[PDB]
Amino acid sequence: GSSGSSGTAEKPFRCDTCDKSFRQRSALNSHRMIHTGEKPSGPSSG
Ligand SMILES: [Zn+2]
């Protein structure tokens, strides 16, 4: 598994793709878009 997680992101927003976090909703809602393009190992919206 090689899992490495703990607690939660001090911030309310978090990217369930690269394990990121933002302070402003407009900052994350946009960052998630960058992931909605390439063909990474893990398809979504299906
Ligand atoms: Zn991300």
Side-chain angles (χ1 to χ4, degrees):
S2 281
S3 184
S5 203
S6 53
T8 54
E10 29 170 29
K11 304 321 297 203
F13 312 93
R14 190 196 61 202
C15 179
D16 188 52
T17 314
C18 59
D19 185 24
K20 268 197 204 192
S21 46
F22 301 66
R23 306 207 279 276
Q24 315 277 340
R25 194 174 170 178
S26 175
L28 157 91
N29 271 355
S30 271
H31 165 86
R32 301 210 61 158
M33 301 207 251
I34 86 200
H35 299 312
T36 68
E38 277 274 65
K39 52 168 292 88
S41 289
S44 51
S45 186

PDB file of all heavy atoms in Angstrom:
ATOM      1  N   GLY A   1       0.806  -1.207   0.000  1.00  0.00           N
ATOM      2  CA  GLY A   1       0.000   0.000   0.000  1.00  0.00           C
ATOM      3  C   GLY A   1       0.843   1.261   0.000  1.00  0.00           C
ATOM      4  O   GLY A   1       0.530   2.224  -0.699  1.00  0.00           O
ATOM      5  N   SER A   2       1.913   1.254   0.788  1.00  0.00           N
ATOM      6  CA  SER A   2       2.799   2.409   0.881  1.00  0.00           C
ATOM      7  C   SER A   2       2.003   3.690   1.106  1.00  0.00           C
ATOM      8  O   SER A   2       2.295   4.727   0.512  1.00  0.00           O
ATOM      9  CB  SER A   2       3.643   2.533  -0.389  1.00  0.00           C
ATOM     10  OG  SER A   2       4.725   1.618  -0.376  1.00  0.00           O
ATOM     11  N   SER A   3       0.994   3.609   1.966  1.00  0.00           N
ATOM     12  CA  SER A   3       0.151   4.761   2.267  1.00  0.00           C
ATOM     13  C   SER A   3       0.857   5.713   3.227  1.00  0.00           C
ATOM     14  O   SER A   3       1.577   5.286   4.127  1.00  0.00           O
ATOM     15  CB  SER A   3      -1.178   4.303   2.870  1.00  0.00           C
ATOM     16  OG  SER A   3      -2.046   5.401   3.085  1.00  0.00           O
ATOM     17  N   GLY A   4       0.643   7.011   3.027  1.00  0.00           N
ATOM     18  CA  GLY A   4       1.264   8.006   3.881  1.00  0.00           C
ATOM     19  C   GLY A   4       0.363   9.199   4.132  1.00  0.00           C
ATOM     20  O   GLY A   4       0.542  10.257   3.529  1.00  0.00           O
ATOM     21  N   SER A   5      -0.608   9.028   5.023  1.00  0.00           N
ATOM     22  CA  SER A   5      -1.544  10.098   5.348  1.00  0.00           C
ATOM     23  C   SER A   5      -1.670  10.269   6.859  1.00  0.00           C
ATOM     24  O   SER A   5      -1.356   9.359   7.626  1.00  0.00           O
ATOM     25  CB  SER A   5      -2.917   9.805   4.740  1.00  0.00           C
ATOM     26  OG  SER A   5      -3.664  10.997   4.569  1.00  0.00           O
ATOM     27  N   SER A   6      -2.133  11.442   7.279  1.00  0.00           N
ATOM     28  CA  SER A   6      -2.297  11.736   8.697  1.00  0.00           C
ATOM     29  C   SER A   6      -3.153  12.983   8.899  1.00  0.00           C
ATOM     30  O   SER A   6      -3.106  13.917   8.099  1.00  0.00           O
ATOM     31  CB  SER A   6      -0.933  11.927   9.362  1.00  0.00           C
ATOM     32  OG  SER A   6      -0.160  12.894   8.672  1.00  0.00           O
ATOM     33  N   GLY A   7      -3.935  12.989   9.974  1.00  0.00           N
ATOM     34  CA  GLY A   7      -4.791  14.126  10.262  1.00  0.00           C
ATOM     35  C   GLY A   7      -5.478  14.662   9.022  1.00  0.00           C
ATOM     36  O   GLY A   7      -5.826  13.903   8.117  1.00  0.00           O
ATOM     37  N   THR A   8      -5.678  15.976   8.981  1.00  0.00           N
ATOM     38  CA  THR A   8      -6.332  16.614   7.845  1.00  0.00           C
ATOM     39  C   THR A   8      -5.632  17.914   7.466  1.00  0.00           C
ATOM     40  O   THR A   8      -4.852  18.459   8.247  1.00  0.00           O
ATOM     41  CB  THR A   8      -7.814  16.909   8.142  1.00  0.00           C
ATOM     42  OG1 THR A   8      -7.929  17.665   9.353  1.00  0.00           O
ATOM     43  CG2 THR A   8      -8.608  15.618   8.265  1.00  0.00           C
ATOM     44  N   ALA A   9      -5.917  18.406   6.265  1.00  0.00           N
ATOM     45  CA  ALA A   9      -5.316  19.645   5.785  1.00  0.00           C
ATOM     46  C   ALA A   9      -5.809  20.842   6.591  1.00  0.00           C
ATOM     47  O   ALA A   9      -6.990  21.183   6.553  1.00  0.00           O
ATOM     48  CB  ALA A   9      -5.619  19.841   4.307  1.00  0.00           C
ATOM     49  N   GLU A  10      -4.895  21.474   7.321  1.00  0.00           N
ATOM     50  CA  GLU A  10      -5.238  22.633   8.138  1.00  0.00           C
ATOM     51  C   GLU A  10      -6.245  23.527   7.419  1.00  0.00           C
ATOM     52  O   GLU A  10      -7.010  24.255   8.052  1.00  0.00           O
ATOM     53  CB  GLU A  10      -3.981  23.435   8.480  1.00  0.00           C
ATOM     54  CG  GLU A  10      -2.888  23.330   7.430  1.00  0.00           C
ATOM     55  CD  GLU A  10      -1.756  24.309   7.668  1.00  0.00           C
ATOM     56  OE1 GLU A  10      -1.507  24.657   8.841  1.00  0.00           O
ATOM     57  OE2 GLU A  10      -1.117  24.729   6.679  1.00  0.00           O
ATOM     58  N   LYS A  11      -6.238  23.466   6.092  1.00  0.00           N
ATOM     59  CA  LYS A  11      -7.150  24.268   5.284  1.00  0.00           C
ATOM     60  C   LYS A  11      -8.420  23.488   4.962  1.00  0.00           C
ATOM     61  O   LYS A  11      -8.423  22.259   4.893  1.00  0.00           O
ATOM     62  CB  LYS A  11      -6.465  24.705   3.987  1.00  0.00           C
ATOM     63  CG  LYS A  11      -5.165  25.459   4.210  1.00  0.00           C
ATOM     64  CD  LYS A  11      -5.264  26.401   5.398  1.00  0.00           C
ATOM     65  CE  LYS A  11      -6.310  27.481   5.168  1.00  0.00           C
ATOM     66  NZ  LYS A  11      -6.060  28.684   6.010  1.00  0.00           N
ATOM     67  N   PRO A  12      -9.528  24.217   4.761  1.00  0.00           N
ATOM     68  CA  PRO A  12     -10.825  23.615   4.441  1.00  0.00           C
ATOM     69  C   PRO A  12     -10.853  23.006   3.043  1.00  0.00           C
ATOM     70  O   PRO A  12     -11.573  22.040   2.790  1.00  0.00           O
ATOM     71  CB  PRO A  12     -11.796  24.795   4.529  1.00  0.00           C
ATOM     72  CG  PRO A  12     -10.957  25.997   4.263  1.00  0.00           C
ATOM     73  CD  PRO A  12      -9.599  25.687   4.828  1.00  0.00           C
ATOM     74  N   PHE A  13     -10.065  23.578   2.138  1.00  0.00           N
ATOM     75  CA  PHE A  13     -10.000  23.091   0.765  1.00  0.00           C
ATOM     76  C   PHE A  13      -8.822  22.138   0.580  1.00  0.00           C
ATOM     77  O   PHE A  13      -7.747  22.346   1.144  1.00  0.00           O
ATOM     78  CB  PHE A  13      -9.877  24.264  -0.210  1.00  0.00           C
ATOM     79  CG  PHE A  13     -10.861  25.369   0.055  1.00  0.00           C
ATOM     80  CD1 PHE A  13     -10.515  26.445   0.857  1.00  0.00           C
ATOM     81  CD2 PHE A  13     -12.131  25.330  -0.498  1.00  0.00           C
ATOM     82  CE1 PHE A  13     -11.418  27.462   1.102  1.00  0.00           C
ATOM     83  CE2 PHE A  13     -13.038  26.344  -0.256  1.00  0.00           C
ATOM     84  CZ  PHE A  13     -12.681  27.412   0.544  1.00  0.00           C
ATOM     85  N   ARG A  14      -9.035  21.092  -0.211  1.00  0.00           N
ATOM     86  CA  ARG A  14      -7.993  20.104  -0.468  1.00  0.00           C
ATOM     87  C   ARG A  14      -8.215  19.418  -1.812  1.00  0.00           C
ATOM     88  O   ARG A  14      -9.343  19.084  -2.173  1.00  0.00           O
ATOM     89  CB  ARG A  14      -7.961  19.061   0.650  1.00  0.00           C
ATOM     90  CG  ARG A  14      -6.752  18.141   0.592  1.00  0.00           C
ATOM     91  CD  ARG A  14      -6.951  16.905   1.455  1.00  0.00           C
ATOM     92  NE  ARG A  14      -8.097  16.112   1.020  1.00  0.00           N
ATOM     93  CZ  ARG A  14      -8.734  15.249   1.803  1.00  0.00           C
ATOM     94  NH1 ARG A  14      -8.339  15.069   3.056  1.00  0.00           N
ATOM     95  NH2 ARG A  14      -9.770  14.564   1.334  1.00  0.00           N
ATOM     96  N   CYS A  15      -7.129  19.210  -2.551  1.00  0.00           N
ATOM     97  CA  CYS A  15      -7.204  18.565  -3.856  1.00  0.00           C
ATOM     98  C   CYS A  15      -7.047  17.053  -3.724  1.00  0.00           C
ATOM     99  O   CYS A  15      -5.986  16.559  -3.339  1.00  0.00           O
ATOM    100  CB  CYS A  15      -6.124  19.122  -4.785  1.00  0.00           C
ATOM    101  SG  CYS A  15      -6.111  18.369  -6.444  1.00  0.00           S
ATOM    102  N   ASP A  16      -8.109  16.324  -4.048  1.00  0.00           N
ATOM    103  CA  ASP A  16      -8.090  14.868  -3.967  1.00  0.00           C
ATOM    104  C   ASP A  16      -7.433  14.264  -5.204  1.00  0.00           C
ATOM    105  O   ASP A  16      -7.900  13.259  -5.742  1.00  0.00           O
ATOM    106  CB  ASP A  16      -9.512  14.326  -3.815  1.00  0.00           C
ATOM    107  CG  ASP A  16      -9.536  12.837  -3.523  1.00  0.00           C
ATOM    108  OD1 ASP A  16      -8.836  12.406  -2.584  1.00  0.00           O
ATOM    109  OD2 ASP A  16     -10.254  12.105  -4.236  1.00  0.00           O
ATOM    110  N   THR A  17      -6.345  14.884  -5.653  1.00  0.00           N
ATOM    111  CA  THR A  17      -5.624  14.409  -6.827  1.00  0.00           C
ATOM    112  C   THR A  17      -4.124  14.353  -6.566  1.00  0.00           C
ATOM    113  O   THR A  17      -3.487  13.318  -6.767  1.00  0.00           O
ATOM    114  CB  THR A  17      -5.887  15.310  -8.049  1.00  0.00           C
ATOM    115  OG1 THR A  17      -7.287  15.589  -8.159  1.00  0.00           O
ATOM    116  CG2 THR A  17      -5.396  14.645  -9.327  1.00  0.00           C
ATOM    117  N   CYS A  18      -3.564  15.470  -6.116  1.00  0.00           N
ATOM    118  CA  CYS A  18      -2.138  15.549  -5.826  1.00  0.00           C
ATOM    119  C   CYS A  18      -1.896  15.788  -4.338  1.00  0.00           C
ATOM    120  O   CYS A  18      -0.770  16.049  -3.915  1.00  0.00           O
ATOM    121  CB  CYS A  18      -1.489  16.667  -6.645  1.00  0.00           C
ATOM    122  SG  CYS A  18      -2.201  18.316  -6.345  1.00  0.00           S
ATOM    123  N   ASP A  19      -2.962  15.696  -3.550  1.00  0.00           N
ATOM    124  CA  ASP A  19      -2.867  15.901  -2.110  1.00  0.00           C
ATOM    125  C   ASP A  19      -2.437  17.329  -1.791  1.00  0.00           C
ATOM    126  O   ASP A  19      -1.476  17.550  -1.053  1.00  0.00           O
ATOM    127  CB  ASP A  19      -1.879  14.908  -1.495  1.00  0.00           C
ATOM    128  CG  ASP A  19      -1.825  15.006   0.017  1.00  0.00           C
ATOM    129  OD1 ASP A  19      -2.815  15.474   0.617  1.00  0.00           O
ATOM    130  OD2 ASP A  19      -0.791  14.615   0.600  1.00  0.00           O
ATOM    131  N   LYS A  20      -3.152  18.297  -2.353  1.00  0.00           N
ATOM    132  CA  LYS A  20      -2.846  19.705  -2.129  1.00  0.00           C
ATOM    133  C   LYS A  20      -3.945  20.379  -1.316  1.00  0.00           C
ATOM    134  O   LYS A  20      -4.958  19.760  -0.991  1.00  0.00           O
ATOM    135  CB  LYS A  20      -2.670  20.428  -3.467  1.00  0.00           C
ATOM    136  CG  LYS A  20      -1.234  20.453  -3.961  1.00  0.00           C
ATOM    137  CD  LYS A  20      -1.033  21.508  -5.035  1.00  0.00           C
ATOM    138  CE  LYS A  20       0.153  21.175  -5.929  1.00  0.00           C
ATOM    139  NZ  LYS A  20       0.536  22.325  -6.795  1.00  0.00           N
ATOM    140  N   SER A  21      -3.739  21.651  -0.990  1.00  0.00           N
ATOM    141  CA  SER A  21      -4.712  22.408  -0.212  1.00  0.00           C
ATOM    142  C   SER A  21      -4.578  23.904  -0.482  1.00  0.00           C
ATOM    143  O   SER A  21      -3.480  24.408  -0.719  1.00  0.00           O
ATOM    144  CB  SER A  21      -4.530  22.131   1.281  1.00  0.00           C
ATOM    145  OG  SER A  21      -3.162  22.184   1.647  1.00  0.00           O
ATOM    146  N   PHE A  22      -5.705  24.608  -0.445  1.00  0.00           N
ATOM    147  CA  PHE A  22      -5.716  26.047  -0.687  1.00  0.00           C
ATOM    148  C   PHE A  22      -6.526  26.772   0.382  1.00  0.00           C
ATOM    149  O   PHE A  22      -7.297  26.155   1.118  1.00  0.00           O
ATOM    150  CB  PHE A  22      -6.292  26.348  -2.072  1.00  0.00           C
ATOM    151  CG  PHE A  22      -5.528  25.702  -3.193  1.00  0.00           C
ATOM    152  CD1 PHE A  22      -5.503  24.324  -3.327  1.00  0.00           C
ATOM    153  CD2 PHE A  22      -4.837  26.474  -4.112  1.00  0.00           C
ATOM    154  CE1 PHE A  22      -4.800  23.728  -4.357  1.00  0.00           C
ATOM    155  CE2 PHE A  22      -4.133  25.884  -5.145  1.00  0.00           C
ATOM    156  CZ  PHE A  22      -4.115  24.509  -5.268  1.00  0.00           C
ATOM    157  N   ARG A  23      -6.345  28.087   0.464  1.00  0.00           N
ATOM    158  CA  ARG A  23      -7.058  28.896   1.445  1.00  0.00           C
ATOM    159  C   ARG A  23      -8.346  29.459   0.852  1.00  0.00           C
ATOM    160  O   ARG A  23      -9.359  29.575   1.541  1.00  0.00           O
ATOM    161  CB  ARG A  23      -6.169  30.040   1.936  1.00  0.00           C
ATOM    162  CG  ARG A  23      -4.821  29.578   2.466  1.00  0.00           C
ATOM    163  CD  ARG A  23      -4.270  30.543   3.504  1.00  0.00           C
ATOM    164  NE  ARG A  23      -3.628  31.702   2.888  1.00  0.00           N
ATOM    165  CZ  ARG A  23      -2.372  31.704   2.460  1.00  0.00           C
ATOM    166  NH1 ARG A  23      -1.625  30.615   2.579  1.00  0.00           N
ATOM    167  NH2 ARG A  23      -1.859  32.797   1.909  1.00  0.00           N
ATOM    168  N   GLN A  24      -8.300  29.806  -0.430  1.00  0.00           N
ATOM    169  CA  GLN A  24      -9.463  30.358  -1.115  1.00  0.00           C
ATOM    170  C   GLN A  24     -10.101  29.317  -2.030  1.00  0.00           C
ATOM    171  O   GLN A  24      -9.408  28.625  -2.776  1.00  0.00           O
ATOM    172  CB  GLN A  24      -9.066  31.592  -1.926  1.00  0.00           C
ATOM    173  CG  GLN A  24      -8.159  32.550  -1.171  1.00  0.00           C
ATOM    174  CD  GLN A  24      -8.927  33.494  -0.269  1.00  0.00           C
ATOM    175  OE1 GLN A  24     -10.127  33.705  -0.450  1.00  0.00           O
ATOM    176  NE2 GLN A  24      -8.241  34.068   0.712  1.00  0.00           N
ATOM    177  N   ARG A  25     -11.424  29.212  -1.966  1.00  0.00           N
ATOM    178  CA  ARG A  25     -12.155  28.254  -2.787  1.00  0.00           C
ATOM    179  C   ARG A  25     -11.867  28.478  -4.270  1.00  0.00           C
ATOM    180  O   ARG A  25     -11.822  27.530  -5.053  1.00  0.00           O
ATOM    181  CB  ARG A  25     -13.658  28.368  -2.526  1.00  0.00           C
ATOM    182  CG  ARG A  25     -14.462  27.203  -3.080  1.00  0.00           C
ATOM    183  CD  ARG A  25     -15.922  27.288  -2.667  1.00  0.00           C
ATOM    184  NE  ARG A  25     -16.751  26.323  -3.384  1.00  0.00           N
ATOM    185  CZ  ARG A  25     -18.053  26.167  -3.168  1.00  0.00           C
ATOM    186  NH1 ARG A  25     -18.671  26.913  -2.261  1.00  0.00           N
ATOM    187  NH2 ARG A  25     -18.740  25.268  -3.861  1.00  0.00           N
ATOM    188  N   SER A  26     -11.673  29.738  -4.645  1.00  0.00           N
ATOM    189  CA  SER A  26     -11.395  30.087  -6.034  1.00  0.00           C
ATOM    190  C   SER A  26      -9.989  29.647  -6.432  1.00  0.00           C
ATOM    191  O   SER A  26      -9.667  29.560  -7.617  1.00  0.00           O
ATOM    192  CB  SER A  26     -11.550  31.595  -6.243  1.00  0.00           C
ATOM    193  OG  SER A  26     -11.183  31.967  -7.561  1.00  0.00           O
ATOM    194  N   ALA A  27      -9.157  29.373  -5.433  1.00  0.00           N
ATOM    195  CA  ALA A  27      -7.787  28.941  -5.679  1.00  0.00           C
ATOM    196  C   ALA A  27      -7.723  27.440  -5.943  1.00  0.00           C
ATOM    197  O   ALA A  27      -6.925  26.977  -6.760  1.00  0.00           O
ATOM    198  CB  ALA A  27      -6.898  29.310  -4.500  1.00  0.00           C
ATOM    199  N   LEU A  28      -8.566  26.686  -5.248  1.00  0.00           N
ATOM    200  CA  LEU A  28      -8.606  25.236  -5.407  1.00  0.00           C
ATOM    201  C   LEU A  28      -9.504  24.841  -6.575  1.00  0.00           C
ATOM    202  O   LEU A  28      -9.125  24.022  -7.412  1.00  0.00           O
ATOM    203  CB  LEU A  28      -9.103  24.576  -4.119  1.00  0.00           C
ATOM    204  CG  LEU A  28      -9.717  23.183  -4.274  1.00  0.00           C
ATOM    205  CD1 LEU A  28      -8.652  22.110  -4.106  1.00  0.00           C
ATOM    206  CD2 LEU A  28     -10.842  22.982  -3.269  1.00  0.00           C
ATOM    207  N   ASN A  29     -10.694  25.429  -6.625  1.00  0.00           N
ATOM    208  CA  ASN A  29     -11.645  25.140  -7.693  1.00  0.00           C
ATOM    209  C   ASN A  29     -10.988  25.286  -9.061  1.00  0.00           C
ATOM    210  O   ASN A  29     -11.398  24.646 -10.029  1.00  0.00           O
ATOM    211  CB  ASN A  29     -12.855  26.072  -7.592  1.00  0.00           C
ATOM    212  CG  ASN A  29     -13.947  25.508  -6.704  1.00  0.00           C
ATOM    213  OD1 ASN A  29     -13.857  24.373  -6.234  1.00  0.00           O
ATOM    214  ND2 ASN A  29     -14.987  26.300  -6.471  1.00  0.00           N
ATOM    215  N   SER A  30      -9.966  26.133  -9.134  1.00  0.00           N
ATOM    216  CA  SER A  30      -9.254  26.367 -10.385  1.00  0.00           C
ATOM    217  C   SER A  30      -8.093  25.388 -10.539  1.00  0.00           C
ATOM    218  O   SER A  30      -7.823  24.895 -11.635  1.00  0.00           O
ATOM    219  CB  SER A  30      -8.735  27.804 -10.441  1.00  0.00           C
ATOM    220  OG  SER A  30      -9.703  28.674 -11.004  1.00  0.00           O
ATOM    221  N   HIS A  31      -7.408  25.113  -9.434  1.00  0.00           N
ATOM    222  CA  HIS A  31      -6.275  24.195  -9.444  1.00  0.00           C
ATOM    223  C   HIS A  31      -6.712  22.801  -9.888  1.00  0.00           C
ATOM    224  O   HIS A  31      -5.991  22.117 -10.614  1.00  0.00           O
ATOM    225  CB  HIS A  31      -5.635  24.124  -8.058  1.00  0.00           C
ATOM    226  CG  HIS A  31      -4.706  22.963  -7.885  1.00  0.00           C
ATOM    227  ND1 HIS A  31      -3.374  23.005  -8.238  1.00  0.00           N
ATOM    228  CD2 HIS A  31      -4.923  21.721  -7.392  1.00  0.00           C
ATOM    229  CE1 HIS A  31      -2.813  21.840  -7.971  1.00  0.00           C
ATOM    230  NE2 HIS A  31      -3.731  21.043  -7.456  1.00  0.00           N
ATOM    231  N   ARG A  32      -7.893  22.387  -9.444  1.00  0.00           N
ATOM    232  CA  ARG A  32      -8.423  21.074  -9.792  1.00  0.00           C
ATOM    233  C   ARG A  32      -8.595  20.941 -11.303  1.00  0.00           C
ATOM    234  O   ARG A  32      -8.575  19.837 -11.845  1.00  0.00           O
ATOM    235  CB  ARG A  32      -9.764  20.839  -9.094  1.00  0.00           C
ATOM    236  CG  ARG A  32      -9.683  20.921  -7.578  1.00  0.00           C
ATOM    237  CD  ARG A  32     -10.718  20.023  -6.917  1.00  0.00           C
ATOM    238  NE  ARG A  32     -10.530  18.619  -7.270  1.00  0.00           N
ATOM    239  CZ  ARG A  32     -10.993  17.609  -6.541  1.00  0.00           C
ATOM    240  NH1 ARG A  32     -11.670  17.847  -5.426  1.00  0.00           N
ATOM    241  NH2 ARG A  32     -10.781  16.357  -6.929  1.00  0.00           N
ATOM    242  N   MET A  33      -8.764  22.075 -11.976  1.00  0.00           N
ATOM    243  CA  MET A  33      -8.939  22.084 -13.424  1.00  0.00           C
ATOM    244  C   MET A  33      -7.695  21.547 -14.125  1.00  0.00           C
ATOM    245  O   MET A  33      -7.793  20.762 -15.068  1.00  0.00           O
ATOM    246  CB  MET A  33      -9.242  23.502 -13.913  1.00  0.00           C
ATOM    247  CG  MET A  33     -10.488  24.107 -13.288  1.00  0.00           C
ATOM    248  SD  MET A  33     -11.262  25.347 -14.343  1.00  0.00           S
ATOM    249  CE  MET A  33     -10.876  26.846 -13.441  1.00  0.00           C
ATOM    250  N   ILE A  34      -6.527  21.974 -13.658  1.00  0.00           N
ATOM    251  CA  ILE A  34      -5.265  21.534 -14.240  1.00  0.00           C
ATOM    252  C   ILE A  34      -5.189  20.013 -14.303  1.00  0.00           C
ATOM    253  O   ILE A  34      -4.497  19.450 -15.152  1.00  0.00           O
ATOM    254  CB  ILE A  34      -4.061  22.064 -13.439  1.00  0.00           C
ATOM    255  CG1 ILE A  34      -3.744  21.126 -12.272  1.00  0.00           C
ATOM    256  CG2 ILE A  34      -4.339  23.472 -12.932  1.00  0.00           C
ATOM    257  CD1 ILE A  34      -2.917  21.774 -11.184  1.00  0.00           C
ATOM    258  N   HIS A  35      -5.906  19.352 -13.399  1.00  0.00           N
ATOM    259  CA  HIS A  35      -5.922  17.894 -13.354  1.00  0.00           C
ATOM    260  C   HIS A  35      -6.958  17.332 -14.321  1.00  0.00           C
ATOM    261  O   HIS A  35      -6.880  16.172 -14.727  1.00  0.00           O
ATOM    262  CB  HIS A  35      -6.217  17.410 -11.934  1.00  0.00           C
ATOM    263  CG  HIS A  35      -5.200  17.852 -10.927  1.00  0.00           C
ATOM    264  ND1 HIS A  35      -3.840  17.731 -11.127  1.00  0.00           N
ATOM    265  CD2 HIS A  35      -5.350  18.419  -9.707  1.00  0.00           C
ATOM    266  CE1 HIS A  35      -3.199  18.203 -10.073  1.00  0.00           C
ATOM    267  NE2 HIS A  35      -4.092  18.626  -9.196  1.00  0.00           N
ATOM    268  N   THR A  36      -7.931  18.161 -14.686  1.00  0.00           N
ATOM    269  CA  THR A  36      -8.984  17.746 -15.604  1.00  0.00           C
ATOM    270  C   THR A  36      -8.552  17.925 -17.055  1.00  0.00           C
ATOM    271  O   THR A  36      -9.318  18.410 -17.887  1.00  0.00           O
ATOM    272  CB  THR A  36     -10.282  18.541 -15.366  1.00  0.00           C
ATOM    273  OG1 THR A  36     -10.096  19.910 -15.745  1.00  0.00           O
ATOM    274  CG2 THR A  36     -10.702  18.468 -13.906  1.00  0.00           C
ATOM    275  N   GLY A  37      -7.317  17.529 -17.353  1.00  0.00           N
ATOM    276  CA  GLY A  37      -6.805  17.653 -18.705  1.00  0.00           C
ATOM    277  C   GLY A  37      -5.956  16.466 -19.114  1.00  0.00           C
ATOM    278  O   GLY A  37      -6.385  15.635 -19.912  1.00  0.00           O
ATOM    279  N   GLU A  38      -4.747  16.389 -18.566  1.00  0.00           N
ATOM    280  CA  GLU A  38      -3.835  15.295 -18.882  1.00  0.00           C
ATOM    281  C   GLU A  38      -4.497  13.944 -18.631  1.00  0.00           C
ATOM    282  O   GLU A  38      -5.638  13.874 -18.173  1.00  0.00           O
ATOM    283  CB  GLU A  38      -2.556  15.411 -18.049  1.00  0.00           C
ATOM    284  CG  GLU A  38      -1.526  16.357 -18.643  1.00  0.00           C
ATOM    285  CD  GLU A  38      -0.630  15.678 -19.661  1.00  0.00           C
ATOM    286  OE1 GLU A  38      -1.146  15.260 -20.719  1.00  0.00           O
ATOM    287  OE2 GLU A  38       0.586  15.564 -19.399  1.00  0.00           O
ATOM    288  N   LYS A  39      -3.774  12.872 -18.934  1.00  0.00           N
ATOM    289  CA  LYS A  39      -4.289  11.521 -18.742  1.00  0.00           C
ATOM    290  C   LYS A  39      -3.499  10.786 -17.664  1.00  0.00           C
ATOM    291  O   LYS A  39      -2.775   9.828 -17.937  1.00  0.00           O
ATOM    292  CB  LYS A  39      -4.231  10.739 -20.056  1.00  0.00           C
ATOM    293  CG  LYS A  39      -2.867  10.770 -20.722  1.00  0.00           C
ATOM    294  CD  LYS A  39      -2.775   9.758 -21.853  1.00  0.00           C
ATOM    295  CE  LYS A  39      -2.802   8.331 -21.328  1.00  0.00           C
ATOM    296  NZ  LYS A  39      -4.193   7.813 -21.203  1.00  0.00           N
ATOM    297  N   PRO A  40      -3.639  11.242 -16.411  1.00  0.00           N
ATOM    298  CA  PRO A  40      -2.947  10.640 -15.268  1.00  0.00           C
ATOM    299  C   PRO A  40      -3.486   9.254 -14.928  1.00  0.00           C
ATOM    300  O   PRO A  40      -4.502   8.824 -15.471  1.00  0.00           O
ATOM    301  CB  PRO A  40      -3.231  11.619 -14.125  1.00  0.00           C
ATOM    302  CG  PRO A  40      -4.502  12.293 -14.512  1.00  0.00           C
ATOM    303  CD  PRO A  40      -4.485  12.380 -16.013  1.00  0.00           C
ATOM    304  N   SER A  41      -2.797   8.562 -14.026  1.00  0.00           N
ATOM    305  CA  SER A  41      -3.205   7.223 -13.617  1.00  0.00           C
ATOM    306  C   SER A  41      -4.354   7.287 -12.617  1.00  0.00           C
ATOM    307  O   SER A  41      -4.150   7.177 -11.409  1.00  0.00           O
ATOM    308  CB  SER A  41      -2.021   6.472 -13.003  1.00  0.00           C
ATOM    309  OG  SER A  41      -1.065   6.131 -13.991  1.00  0.00           O
ATOM    310  N   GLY A  42      -5.568   7.467 -13.131  1.00  0.00           N
ATOM    311  CA  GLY A  42      -6.734   7.543 -12.270  1.00  0.00           C
ATOM    312  C   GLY A  42      -7.844   8.382 -12.872  1.00  0.00           C
ATOM    313  O   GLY A  42      -7.981   9.570 -12.577  1.00  0.00           O
ATOM    314  N   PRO A  43      -8.660   7.760 -13.736  1.00  0.00           N
ATOM    315  CA  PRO A  43      -9.777   8.441 -14.399  1.00  0.00           C
ATOM    316  C   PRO A  43     -10.903   8.783 -13.431  1.00  0.00           C
ATOM    317  O   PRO A  43     -11.147   8.059 -12.465  1.00  0.00           O
ATOM    318  CB  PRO A  43     -10.252   7.415 -15.432  1.00  0.00           C
ATOM    319  CG  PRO A  43      -9.837   6.097 -14.876  1.00  0.00           C
ATOM    320  CD  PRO A  43      -8.554   6.347 -14.133  1.00  0.00           C
ATOM    321  N   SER A  44     -11.589   9.891 -13.695  1.00  0.00           N
ATOM    322  CA  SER A  44     -12.689  10.330 -12.845  1.00  0.00           C
ATOM    323  C   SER A  44     -13.885  10.767 -13.685  1.00  0.00           C
ATOM    324  O   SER A  44     -13.863  10.673 -14.913  1.00  0.00           O
ATOM    325  CB  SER A  44     -12.237  11.482 -11.945  1.00  0.00           C
ATOM    326  OG  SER A  44     -11.605  12.501 -12.700  1.00  0.00           O
ATOM    327  N   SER A  45     -14.929  11.243 -13.016  1.00  0.00           N
ATOM    328  CA  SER A  45     -16.137  11.691 -13.699  1.00  0.00           C
ATOM    329  C   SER A  45     -16.767  10.550 -14.491  1.00  0.00           C
ATOM    330  O   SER A  45     -17.182  10.728 -15.636  1.00  0.00           O
ATOM    331  CB  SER A  45     -15.816  12.859 -14.634  1.00  0.00           C
ATOM    332  OG  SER A  45     -16.997  13.394 -15.205  1.00  0.00           O
ATOM    333  N   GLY A  46     -16.837   9.375 -13.872  1.00  0.00           N
ATOM    334  CA  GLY A  46     -17.418   8.221 -14.532  1.00  0.00           C
ATOM    335  C   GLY A  46     -18.082   7.268 -13.558  1.00  0.00           C
ATOM    336  O   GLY A  46     -17.514   6.217 -13.266  1.00  0.00           O
TER     337      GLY A  46
HETATM  338 ZN    ZN B   1      -4.042  18.978  -7.331  1.00  0.00          ZN
END
